[PDB]
Amino acid sequence: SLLEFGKMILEETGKLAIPSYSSYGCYCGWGGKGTPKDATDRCCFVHDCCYGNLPDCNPKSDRYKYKRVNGAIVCEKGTSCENRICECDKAAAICFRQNLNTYSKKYMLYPDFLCKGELKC
Ligand SMILES: CC(C)NC[C@@H](O)COc1ccc(CC(N)=O)cc1
């Protein structure tokens, strides 16, 4: 669920899920349309695509359990939806951590009209 994801982001990046990643680019937080603005925006695009592969699960509200083995994120055995959601977030977190160095504030609160373009998962 989102309680898990946000906690994961903070631990990983140090920035806070909301508002650092709840309204960035064209995909973080708001999904929909567009061409991802930057690397962090691409993690969101890929992440949204990740939840999209799980039709009958509830990413936002189904809680899962994960642990750290010296820094590694280890998703714990749960329902199979819980296992797959967890993997989807673990990636976003890793991806987020990987492009902290290019996280740019001008994409914060990014306006919608500026997000039109085509991208299939
Ligand atoms: C505590 C506050 C009010 N949070 C409400 C909460 O709905 C914030 O919302 C969201 C909505 C959707 C997502 C999708 C995720 N990033 O992939 C992440 C966070």
Can you lay out the helices and strands and say which pair or pack?
Elements: H1 2-13, H2 17-21, H3 39-51, E1 66-69, E2 72-75, H4 80-98
Helix pairs in contact: 1-4, 3-4
Bound molecules: 2-(4-(2-hydroxy-3-(isopropylamino)propoxy)phenyl)ethanamide.
2-(4-(2-hydroxy-3-(isopropylamino)propoxy)phenyl)ethanamide is lined by residues 2, 18, 22, 29, 47, 60.
Structure report:
This is Basic phospholipase A2 VRV-PL-VIIIa. Its EC number is 3.1.1.4. Keywords: Blood coagulation cascade inhibiting toxin, Calcium, Disulfide bond, Hemostasis impairing toxin, Hydrolase, Lipid degradation, Lipid metabolism, Metal-binding, Myotoxin, Neurotoxin, Presynaptic neurotoxin, Secreted, Toxin. Monomer. It is found in: Secreted. The longest helix has 19 residues, at about 80-100. Strand 1 and strand 2 (about 70-75) form a beta hairpin. This protein has four helices and two strands, in the order αααββα. The protein has a single domain (about 1-120), classed as Phospholipase A2, CATH 1.20.90. It is globular and about 40 Å long. Helix 1 (about 1-15) packs parallel to helix 4 (about 80-100). The protein has a two-stranded antiparallel ribbon with strand order 1-2. It has about 120 residues and is mainly alpha-helical. The structure holds 2-(4-(2-hydroxy-3-(isopropylamino)propoxy)phenyl)ethanamide. 2-(4-(2-hydroxy-3-(isopropylamino)propoxy)phenyl)ethanamide (2TN) binds next to loops.
